[PDB]
RNA sequence: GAGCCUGCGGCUUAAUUUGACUCAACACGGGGAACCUCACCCGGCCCGGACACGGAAAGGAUUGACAGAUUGACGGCUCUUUCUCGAUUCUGUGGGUGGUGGUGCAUGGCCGUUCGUAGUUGGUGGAGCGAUUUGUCUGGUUGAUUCCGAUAACGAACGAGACUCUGGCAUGCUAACUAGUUACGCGGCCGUCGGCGUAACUUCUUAGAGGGACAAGUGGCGUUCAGCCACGCGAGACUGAGCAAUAACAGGUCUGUGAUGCCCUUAGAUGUCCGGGGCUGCACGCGCGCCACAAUGGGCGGAUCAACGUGUCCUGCGCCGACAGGCGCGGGUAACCCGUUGAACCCCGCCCGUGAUGGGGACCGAUUGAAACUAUUUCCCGAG
């Protein structure tokens, strides 16, 4: 097991969700979507 | 001589069928017997809620109410076909003997 | 029979069956244990005469009893070892031979509906033994 | 129905309410009310029925309240 | 402790009907069942329970 | 034959639970909304409720008879044991599964997700009285973790009346980037003795009639 | 040939929806997966009380 | 397949007379319910419809366990010149 | 802590598959796996590579075969061989299909959890340049932002409550030969009788609707309200359960799906059919449980008692048997038969007498459904 489970983890992974372009791309939404 | 049974799941549809059956036979002035109430049979299904393994051991126990109502009549079966033909109701099933 | 102790009745009735040696009392009466849930042999030598007394008494309360229904009466809590104990029926042969032993006397008869019931003579002796034990105290 | 103790407490209440109903239908209530106060003064369960029933079992442990042992870490 | 649904419905009864309701729970329950269409039977008794309680206050003095 | 009543009613539910699954995949684009069966010892009649009764049929009643030839071969019905009829609902603005199905081919035609959800929301308000809720996105994820909830108009979530006052429809739409879910919760208005909504009032509602205007006092 | 007798034991009974051999519910004549019976429980007539 | 000579003609004559076909997902069923006179397994009728489906003649839907095949106006004429029957025979659709 | 099976780690092994790892993994994936399940391993068949184009073409392209050998197999898949079948097949490059193969840190859906607590949100108006704030509260009360009130807020929407389900008591209504009861007749027995048969009836049984319970009366406390406490009368001053927001989690699930993206595999297959083994292998660690260490117990009689259940498969009776069982005769697709569910604990006698004993049991021929290897488990005896 682990003594501090709420930690970073891997090198390219984190405990919180992070995007590669902060929403923009071809696999996720979250980019500039204001005037639609 | 003929025993009419009423197999229904919802009581609202069951009580309405046995109502018109007594009235449907009253117009012929037949010595009919009162509707009896068979013991309600429920079907217990205790399933684990989680689809696979991970959970807190939560079971959801289903039930299925099956109601039975009998009505005994001693009358010839010559013209009872039309009496049952005017007893159409979805969800209920009549099995005359 | 209800106005007396059911244990004192079966003890007094056991002597009446042993007094008249018209029973069967098979050869294997002292080698077999009365049920698979029991472990040792009975302590009393004449257990067959006591079992036949209780067997004929149950027929007075309710008739139409066979061998499969008498082994349900004489059942117990079978110690399954490390496994939790459960209920296990008795032996069919020791119950059938008892019912056949009562057939030798004019106490029981086979009813057409199934099982075994009592005879007009069986209820006759059963009530007098209950009557003589009621006058004892 | 019931068990041994469930029946010995049932028949004592059955015959107690039996005499209080006979005196009500054919005799005066002064004779009926007299025998009701003497029975209730000793034990209330002799005439008043106990509506207590066995609660249903809930999953996660034996019986209704008790639960299985939880293992921490 | 009553809730807002019974509190609100109990006050409107007195504002519209005052020459018919009384100080008894069973009598006020009958008139409340007659004029008001309440779905639940337990909720109907909750409204009649608080309506009769306001009668002891109204007979004592005005209410806000 | 001569099976106990416990399994007799269970077999009836299986026949309905499976027949609905077949008509769900077949009449998805036609606007399927439900079926009603009449289990009778003479002719087990089963009718289909679709939003467009002209699309379920073929050229001249061709497709409606083609489906009857399939249900007879699956459950073993005779040549005249089941007859499928076409009947349309009163209005499409309150059938949850009809709206979830109508939202499927919209996203399959390259329509924007936001404009499609706002379109089906206004449709329920225009056709109906109580609001609804359309949730078409990825709920649990770390990259698709976009709830995108559109809730409005008297949304009930707890209690027993949550059954006969709001119906939920969960459908799926698979696309090039994955598969998306469609959760629609439409609430029906109160309609006495009508198929538009439930004929029973909410328990949290006490309507008081107006006081009698009796001027004839003496 | 190419037909092994399987009528008694785990392998002859399978779910009539997903063709699986785990979590079967064959009481009362259902023969459905435990993760699939919940999907059609409302259609069969089983409700939670 | 192995011997699709006397079986496929029996399948097509039933598929043309009745424009529907059902087959449970079971390759071990050696006796098809709609074709009992011939000891044709369920695999033969399932693989036969797999051929017509790939040719763009019939569409298939996947139920719980059974397959449902629906002929088209282009597939019926493909079976007309194959079965050697007049154009005056109509399937179970009408 | 001891004994033992079940789950986890580790070790070992051809493999000793795999998901999960504080509550929120570890009698969990109903996962109580002897084959099958099975995804793993050592090995043999199978195409179940449809459909598009060409090669090969009725002067045959092509699977099937105990003629022996071979082999795990009477598997024709290889050797030697005759053959009968007659354009579906075959070896080629494209493309399809199958997958319990990878990624749940691509996803749907579902469940668990935050989190059972009482907690959320916008409309208009007020404050601030603004993020935001008031409403959503000083006080009292309530399981409850539940109400009473205060009030730059007003009027409302989720949650709570209501509702649903279940338990509760009328010589009540509506009913009963698939439930009974009280009379009467008849028979047995010295009142007893689930012995038999038909007349009344619906208390008992079954279940339909509607009556009943609200802090309504009494008293006290509290600006008097909200309500709380005590007490008449009473079937209740009520019981358990279901449902359960907002927002969120790289929690679990690609292994439950013919939910599914991408990637991989695709004929010497990660497709699946069969045979064998493993998943059960052990110096050990952990967790959930069982049974005990008996004095309140154990051992043999007898004698009284049931609720939710289940049934094509449950059982009834005769016969045989140490019993597990076996041989016969019947009923029940069901308030009908099993069945008046004659259960254990408890009760009434006897035995044993604190001694690992008669407490506790590990481990060590007769059956039954198959394939009893690895002793599935039971039955008897012995060891214990
Ligand atoms: Zn299934």
From TrEMBL, chain C:
Q: Name one GO biological process term.
A: erythrocyte development
Q: What InterPro entries has UniProt attached to this entry? A: Ribosomal_eS19, Ribosomal_eS19_CS, WH-like_DNA-bd_sf, WH_DNA-bd_sf
Q: Which Pfam families match?
A: Ribosomal_S19e
Q: Name one GO cellular component term.
A: ribosome
Q: Where in the cell is it found?
A: Cytoplasm; Nucleus
Q: Name one GO molecular function term.
A: RNA binding
Subunit (UniProt): Component of the small ribosomal subunit.
**Listed name of the protein:** Small ribosomal subunit protein eS19
TrEMBL record, chain E:
What family does this belong to? Answer: Belongs to the eukaryotic ribosomal protein eS17 family.
Question: Which species is listed as the source?
Answer: Danio rerio (Zebrafish)
Superkingdom in the source lineage = Eukaryota
Its name, as the record gives it, is Small ribosomal subunit protein eS17
Automatic annotation (TrEMBL), chain F:
* InterPro entries, per the entry: KH_dom-like_a/b, KH_dom_type_2, KH_sf_prok-type, Ribosomal_S3_C_sf, Ribosomal_uS3, Ribosomal_uS3_C, Ribosomal_uS3_CS, Ribosomal_uS3_euk/arc
Localization terms from the record: Cytoplasm, Cytoskeleton, Spindle; Mitochondrion inner membrane; Nucleus, Nucleolus
What's one Pfam family here? Ribosomal_S3_C
Reaction(s) catalysed by this chain's protein: 2'-deoxyribonucleotide-(2'-deoxyribose 5'-phosphate)-2'-deoxyribonucleotide-DNA = a 3'-end 2'-deoxyribonucleotide-(2,3-dehydro-2,3-deoxyribose 5'-phosphate)-DNA + a 5'-end 5'-phospho-2'-deoxyribonucleoside-DNA + H(+)
Keywords, sorted A to Z: Apoptosis, Cell cycle, Cell division, DNA damage, DNA repair, Lyase, Mitosis, Ribonucleoprotein, Ribosomal protein, RNA-binding
**Membrane topology annotation:** Peripheral membrane protein
What protein family does this chain belong to? Belongs to the universal ribosomal protein uS3 family.
What this protein is called in its record is DNA-(apurinic or apyrimidinic site) lyase
Species: Danio rerio (Zebrafish)
TrEMBL record, chain H:
Originating organism = Danio rerio
> Which GO molecular function annotations are given, in alphabetical order?
RNA binding; structural constituent of ribosome
Cellular component, GO annotation: cytosolic small ribosomal subunit
Q: Which residues form the Plectin/eS10 N-terminal domain?
A: 3-94
Intracellular or extracellular location(s): Cytoplasm
Specify the protein name.
Ribosomal protein S10
Included range, full protein: 1 to 94 of 166
Keyword terms: Cytoplasm, Ribonucleoprotein, Ribosomal protein
Name of the gene:
rps10
Ligase keyword on record? no
Q: Any signal peptide, and if so, which residues?
A: none
Spans through the membrane: none
Domain of life, source organism: Eukaryota
Q: Provide the family line.
A: Belongs to the eukaryotic ribosomal protein eS10 family.
- Entry keyword annotation includes Cell cycle: no
């Amino acid at each position: 097991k682990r003594e501090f489970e709420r930690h970073s983890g891997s090198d390219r992974s984190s405990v919180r969700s992070e995007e590669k372009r902060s929403g923009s791309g071809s696999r996720n939404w979250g980019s500039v979507r204001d005037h639609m | 001589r003929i025993r009419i049974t009423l197999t229904s799941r919802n009581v609202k549809s069951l009580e309405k069928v046995c109502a018109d059956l007594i009235r449907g036979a009253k117009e012929k002035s037949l010595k009919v017997k009162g509707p009896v109430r068979m013991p309600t049979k429920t079907l217990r299904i205790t399933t684990r809620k989680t689809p696979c393994g991970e959970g807190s051991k939560t079971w959801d126990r289903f039930q299925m109410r099956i109601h039975k109502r009998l009505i005994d009549l001693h009358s010839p079966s010559e013209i009872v076909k039309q009496i049952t033909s005017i007893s159409i109701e979805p969800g209920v099933e009549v099995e005359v003997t | 029979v209800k106005d007396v102790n059911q244990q004192e009745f079966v003890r007094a009735l056991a002597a009446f069956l042993k007094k008249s040696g018209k029973l069967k009392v098979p050869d294997w009466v002292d080698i077999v244990k009365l049920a698979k849930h029991k472990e040792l042999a009975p302590c009393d030598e004449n257990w067959f005469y006591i079992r036949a007394a209780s067997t004929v008494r149950h027929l007075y309360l309710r008739g139409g009893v066979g061998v499969g229904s008498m082994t349900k009466i004489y059942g117990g809590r079978k110690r399954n070892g490390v496994c939790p104990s459960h209920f296990s029926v008795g032996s069919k042969n020791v119950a059938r031979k008892v019912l056949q032993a009562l057939e030798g006397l004019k106490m029981v008869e086979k009813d057409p509906n199934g099982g075994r019931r009592l005879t007009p003579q069986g209820t006759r002796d059963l009530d007098r033994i209950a009557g003589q034990v009621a006058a004892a105290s | 129905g019931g068990g041994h103790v469930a029946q010995v407490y049932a028949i004592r209440q059955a015959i107690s309410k039996a005499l209080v109903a006979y005196y009500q239908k054919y005799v005066d209530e002064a004779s009926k009310k007299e025998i009701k106060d003497i029975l209730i003064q000793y034990d209330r369960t002799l005439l008043v029925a106990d509506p207590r029933r066995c609660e249903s079992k809930k999953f996660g442990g034996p019986g209704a309240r008790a639960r299985y042992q939880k293992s921490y870490r | 402790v009553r809730t807002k649904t019974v509190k609100k419905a109990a006050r409107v009864i007195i504002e519209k009907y005052y020459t018919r309701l009384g100080n008894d729970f069973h009598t006020n329950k009958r008139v409340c069942e007659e004029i008001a269409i309440i779905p639940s039977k337990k909720l109907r008794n909750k409204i009649a329970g608080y309506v009769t309680h306001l009668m002891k206050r109204i007979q004592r003095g005005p209410v806000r | 034959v001569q099976i106990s009543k416990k399994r007799k009613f269970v077999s009836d539910g299986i026949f309905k639970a499976e027949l609905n699954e077949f008509l769900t995949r077949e009449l998805a684009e036609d606007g399927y909304s439900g079926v009603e069966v009449r289990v009778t010892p003479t002719r087990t009649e089963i009718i289909i409720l679709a939003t467009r009764t002209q699309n379920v049929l073929g050229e001249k009643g061709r497709r409606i008879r083609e489906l009857t030839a399939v249900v007879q071969k699956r459950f073993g019905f005779p040549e005249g044991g089941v007859e499928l009829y076409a009947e349309k609902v009163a209005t499409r603005g309150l059938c949850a599964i009809a709206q979830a199905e109508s939202l499927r081919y919209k996203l399959l035609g390259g329509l924007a997700v936001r404009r499609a959800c706002y379109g089906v929301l206004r449709f329920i308000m225009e056709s109906g009285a109580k609001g609804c809720e359309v949730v078409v996105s990825g709920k649990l994820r770390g990259q698709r973790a976009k709830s995108m909830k559109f809730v409005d108009g008297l949304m009930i979530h707890s209690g027993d009346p949550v059954n006969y006052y709001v119906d939920t429809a969960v459908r799926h739409v698979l696309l090039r980037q994955g598969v998306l879910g469609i959760k629609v919760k439409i609430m029906l208005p109160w309609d006495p003795s009508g198929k538009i909504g439930p004929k029973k009032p909410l328990p949290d509602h006490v309507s008081i009639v107006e006081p009698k205007e009796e001027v004839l006092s003496t | 040939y190419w037909s092994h007798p399987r009528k008694y034991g785990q392998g002859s009974r399978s779910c009539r929806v997903c063709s699986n051999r785990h979590g079967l519910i064959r009481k009362y004549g259902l023969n459905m997966c435990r993760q699939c019976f919940r999907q059609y429980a409302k259609d069969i007539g089983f409700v939670k009380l | 397949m192995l011997m699709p000579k006397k079986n496929r003609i029996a399948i097509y004559e039933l598929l043309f007379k009745e424009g529907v076909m059902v087959a449970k997902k079971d390759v071990h069923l050696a006796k098809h319910p709609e074709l009992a006179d011939k000891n044709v397994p369920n695999l033969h009728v399932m693989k036969a419809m797999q051929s017509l489906k790939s040719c763009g003649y019939v569409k298939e839907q996947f139920a719980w366990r059974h397959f449902y095949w629906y002929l088209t106006n282009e597939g019926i004429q493909y079976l007309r010149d194959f079965l050697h029957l007049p154009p005056e025979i109509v399937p179970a659709t009408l």
